[PDB]
Amino acid sequence: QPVNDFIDTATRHVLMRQGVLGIKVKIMRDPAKSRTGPKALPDAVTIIEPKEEEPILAPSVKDY
Amino acid sequence: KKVYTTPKKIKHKHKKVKLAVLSYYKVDAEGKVTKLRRECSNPTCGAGVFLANHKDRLYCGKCHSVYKVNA
RNA sequence: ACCCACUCGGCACCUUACGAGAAAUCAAAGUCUUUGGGUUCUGGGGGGAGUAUGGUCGCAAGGCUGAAACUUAAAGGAAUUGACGGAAGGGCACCACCAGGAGUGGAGCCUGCGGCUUAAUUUGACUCAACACGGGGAAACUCACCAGGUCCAGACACAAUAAGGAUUGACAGAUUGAGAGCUCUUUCUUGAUUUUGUGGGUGGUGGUGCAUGGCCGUUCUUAGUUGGUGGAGUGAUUUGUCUGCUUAAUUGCGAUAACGAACGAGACCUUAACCUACUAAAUAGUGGUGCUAGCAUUUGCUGGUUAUCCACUUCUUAGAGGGACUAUCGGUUUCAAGCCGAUGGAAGUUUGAGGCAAUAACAGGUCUGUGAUGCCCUUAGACGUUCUGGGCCGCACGCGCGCUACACUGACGGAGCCAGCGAGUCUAACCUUGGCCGAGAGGUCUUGGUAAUCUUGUGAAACUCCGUCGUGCUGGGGAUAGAGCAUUGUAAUUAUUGCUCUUCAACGAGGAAUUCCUAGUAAGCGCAAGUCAUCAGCUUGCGUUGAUUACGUCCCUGCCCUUUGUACACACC
Ligand SMILES: [Mg+2]
Ligand SMILES: [Mg+2]
Ligand SMILES: [Mg+2]
Ligand SMILES: [Mg+2]
Ligand SMILES: [Mg+2]
Ligand SMILES: [Mg+2]
Ligand SMILES: [Mg+2]
Ligand SMILES: [Mg+2]
Ligand SMILES: [Mg+2]
Ligand SMILES: [Mg+2]
Ligand SMILES: [Mg+2]
Ligand SMILES: [Mg+2]
Ligand SMILES: [Mg+2]
Ligand SMILES: [Mg+2]
Ligand SMILES: [Mg+2]
Ligand SMILES: [Mg+2]
Ligand SMILES: [Mg+2]
Ligand SMILES: [Mg+2]
Ligand SMILES: [Mg+2]
Ligand SMILES: [Mg+2]
Ligand SMILES: [Mg+2]
Ligand SMILES: [Mg+2]
Ligand SMILES: [Mg+2]
Ligand SMILES: [Mg+2]
Ligand SMILES: [Mg+2]
Ligand SMILES: [Mg+2]
Ligand SMILES: [Zn+2]
Numbered sequence: 010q011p012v013n014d015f016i017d018t019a020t021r022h023v024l025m026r027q028g029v030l031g032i033k034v035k036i037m038r039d040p041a042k043s044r045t046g047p048k049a050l051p052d053a054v055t056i057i058e059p060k061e062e063e064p065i066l067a068p069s070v071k072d073y
Numbered sequence: 074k075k076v077y078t079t080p081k082k083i084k085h086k087h088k089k090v091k092l093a094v095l096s097y098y099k100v101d102a103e104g105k106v107t108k109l110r111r112e113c114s115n116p117t118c119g120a121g122v123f124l125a126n127h128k129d130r131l132y133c134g135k136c137h138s139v140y141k142v143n144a
Numbered sequence: 145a146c147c148c149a150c151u152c153g154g155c156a157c158c159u160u161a162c163g164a165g166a167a168a169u170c171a172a173a174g175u176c177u178u179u180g181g182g183u184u185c186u187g188g189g190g191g192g193a194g195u196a197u198g199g200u201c202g203c204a205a206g207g208c209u210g211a212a213a214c215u216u217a218a219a220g221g222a223a224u225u226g227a228c229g230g231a232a233g234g235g236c237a238c239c240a241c242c243a244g245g246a247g248u249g250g251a252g253c254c255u256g257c258g259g260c261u262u263a264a265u266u267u268g269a270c271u272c273a274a275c276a277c278g279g280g281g282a283a284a285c286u287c288a289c290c291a292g293g294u295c296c297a298g299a300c301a302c303a304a305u306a307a308g309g310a311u312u313g314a315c316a317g318a319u320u321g322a323g324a325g326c327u328c329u330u331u332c333u334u335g336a337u338u339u340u341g342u343g344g345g346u347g348g349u350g351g352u353g354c355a356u357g358g359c360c361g362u363u364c365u366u367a368g369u370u371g372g373u374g375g376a377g378u379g380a381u382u383u384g385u386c387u388g389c390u391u392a393a394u395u396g397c398g399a400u401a402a403c404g405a406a407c408g409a410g411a412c413c414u415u416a417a418c419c420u421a422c423u424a425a426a427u428a429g430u431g432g433u434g435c436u437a438g439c440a441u442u443u444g445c446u447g448g449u450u451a452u453c454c455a456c457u458u459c460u461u462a463g464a465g466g467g468a469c470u471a472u473c474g475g476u477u478u479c480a481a482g483c484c485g486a487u488g489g490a491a492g493u494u495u496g497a498g499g500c501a502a503u504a505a506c507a508g509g510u511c512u513g514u515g516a517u518g519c520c521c522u523u524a525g526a527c528g529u530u531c532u533g534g535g536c537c538g539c540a541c542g543c544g545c546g547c548u549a550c551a552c553u554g555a556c557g558g559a560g561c562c563a564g565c566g567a568g569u570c571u572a573a574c575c576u577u578g579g580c581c582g583a584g585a586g587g588u589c590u591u592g593g594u595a596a597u598c599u600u601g602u603g604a605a606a607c608u609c610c611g612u613c614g615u616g617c618u619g620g621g622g623a624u625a626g627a628g629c630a631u632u633g634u635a636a637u638u639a640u641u642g643c644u645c646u647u648c649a650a651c652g653a654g655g656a657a658u659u660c661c662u663a664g665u666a667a668g669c670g671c672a673a674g675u676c677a678u679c680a681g682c683u684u685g686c687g688u689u690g691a692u693u694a695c696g697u698c699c700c701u702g703c704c705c706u707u708u709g710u711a712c713a714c715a716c717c
Contacts, residue, residue: 010413012500020358028356028518051412074350074527083525084327089339092331093308110332118333125332130316134332138314138325 011050015040097123115140 016037023030040049100106110123113133122135124142131143 010500011411013413022357022516024357024517026518029516031357047412052410077525079525087325087327089311089313090331091309095308122334123332125315125330127316127330127332130330132315132330132332134314135334136315137312137333141315 011040011047014043014046015050111144113140114142 016035018033018035021032023032040047042048097109098106099109108123110126111131112120113122113124113135114120115133115136118133118135122133124131124133129143130141133140133142
């Protein structure tokens with residue numbers, strides 16, 4: 010499916026003197042900018058980076 | 074392929090004749106003009122066009138074929 | 145005789161490399177541009193050629209010595225990557241076998257291909273990967289073929305003819321298949337639009353698919369391709385990308401001079417399965433209520449009623465979510481990826497089936513899909529085009545896909561009576577209900593539908609029941625053939641199709657061979673759609689009924705992989 014989503018293709022037939030040859034163009038657009046669809050490959054698996062914490066500290070409690 | 078066949082005699086075409094034409098028109102000693110070949114009563118052919126003289130047969134050429142006005 | 149230590153001199157092997165080398169390799173092939181221990185011998189691009197000639201030795205065969213002219217841009221070495229083999233080791237698969245199913249191969253016919261025949265019987269394609277393929281079911285059309293007949297729709301440029309008319313048309317007759325003015329007779333008409341010539345164009349189902357684009361098929365039911373940092377190498381390259389194990393998979397585990405990634409596989413998407421959870425519905429449906437029919441009556445049971453009212457969303461529909469991750473547990477395993485069993489679950493074979501699909505290859509197929517196309521051919525007595533008629537169907541015969549059968553698990557007759565995927569008419573005649581008429585095919589009158597609204601609950605077929613027939617080519621079988629009716633169409637003869645009576649063949653389960661297939665699958669059964677005026681024995685899908693046997697292996701066959709050889713690289717054609 011990302012094919013349908015992300016790659017644009019086109020064939021054009023350029024007609025010359027000796028014969029006629031074919032062009033095939035294939036652009037693929039950055040999924041990160043999709044504006045309206047999936048914003049990545051179905052492949053993307055981002056893991057969020059954990060925060061370093063300073064634990065310990067014997068109990069305590071704060072009033073409000 | 075093959076090329077060429079035929080028992081001879083190729084068809085010609087049409088010549089569409091010549092004629093110095095518009096003589097059919099008699100005009101006297103200065104200078105009364107009287108037509109020859111009677112013209113066409115069909116109001117789509119304003120009486121300039123004339124009928125041809127065959128046997129039986131007077132025929133409106135301009136009426137590309139049409140109408141058998143015969144006397 | 146044996147054991148251990150050392151020591152000379154031997155035949156070799158191992159490991160390293162300071163070092164050498166174009167490498168392969170080398171304790172010499174080392175101590176060489178940092179170039180000298182002593183000495184012998186041979187080579188100086190490839191062929192010509194160890195040839196000619198002379199000398200010499202020999203019984204001979206031949207040995208030793210040994211040129212040139214001429215020719216030629218390479219010949220050659222080691223190593224790398226490929227491609228290939230008639231070697232070797234592993235695998236993978238119902239287009240492979242195992243175990244089986246249902247068959248084809250035999251027959252009648254349908255249908256393609258060959259062949260033959262023919263005016264023509266248009267043509268492409270010939271192992272899997274040509275032969276119910278070109279969506280190829282051709283009556284005209286299509287159409288390319290054959291017998292004939294018209295037309296130019298021959299742009300534009302120059303030149304010529306030429307308003308005393310360049311050219312156009314025609315009624316009747318003749319002519320013609322023809323109500324073609326095709327051509328001719330005759331004699332009107334038209335008015336610068338043509339006509340002649342050269343040039344230049346143009347169309348062409350003409351050639352060339354071995355000139356091409358594009359598309360497709362095949363290798364491929366496959367699992368492969370590449371780069372960063374590091375390691376090896378002067379270098380092309382290599383390792384990563386690997387013994388094993390595992391998987392549908394270069395899918396992973398693991399091993400590890402590699403580490404960590406990307407393409408392709410996976411993911412992804414589509415469809416079929418689960419939601420009494422969510423949002424709803426007179427174009428979907430349920431319960432209640434009226435109005436009402438039938439049988440019972442004791443309240444009951446079974447129907448009718450496109451809005452007489454109320455309520456709901458289980459069933460139907462489709463939006464948004466949720467669900468499964470091979471979960472839990474237990475076996476087995478290098479307790480690794482995994483695999484197996486049980487429980488639970490809508491679902492636990494990639495959940496089942498598909499769509500997508502890297503790098504590369506083929507002189508695969510298609511110029512006959514294209515106003516895609518180069519070059520070639522042809523272009524007015526045309527290979528342009530159209531019109532009339534025939535032909536693709538022709539029939540001693542060979543091959544392929546098919547349909548129907550050889551009966552009693554059946555045929556026939558009455559009776560029950562159940563799907564799913566579909567499709568339908570505007571400037572039109574599509575899908576058709578109901579009513580009549582008809583034995584039937586069909587007809588006729590109306591009608592609903594641009595459609596979850598109507599056809600249609602598509603009341604489909606196998607199948608189910610009660611009968612009849614009774615193993616006899618029988619009432620199995622229904623080829624061939626006569627006679628009649630009717631539909632599509634301008635046209636039905638060489639019989640489009642449909643109905644009816646009759647006629648009643650081969651075929652008594654099929655030699656050698658060979659095809660397909662593992663679960664809602666095989667097989668049986670019909671349907672819708674494509675084609676389509678009419679014509680399905682074909683195809684694409686669909687649902688109905690519903691098994692037997694594996695859950696394996698490498699024996700056959702096909703492929704893939706390493707190893708290995710190469711003088712191949714236009715790569716064994
Ligand atoms: Mg040369
Ligand atoms: Mg078998
Ligand atoms: Mg058999
Ligand atoms: Mg014709
Ligand atoms: Mg010309
Ligand atoms: Mg010319
Ligand atoms: Mg053409
Ligand atoms: Mg080709
Ligand atoms: Mg091609
Ligand atoms: Mg050819
Ligand atoms: Mg298979
Ligand atoms: Mg280096
Ligand atoms: Mg490799
Ligand atoms: Mg529901
Ligand atoms: Mg269970
Ligand atoms: Mg070829
Ligand atoms: Mg083409
Ligand atoms: Mg044919
Ligand atoms: Mg076939
Ligand atoms: Mg009757
Ligand atoms: Mg109406
Ligand atoms: Mg009989
Ligand atoms: Mg019968
Ligand atoms: Mg049909
Ligand atoms: Mg067909
Ligand atoms: Mg090699
Ligand atoms: Zn007139």
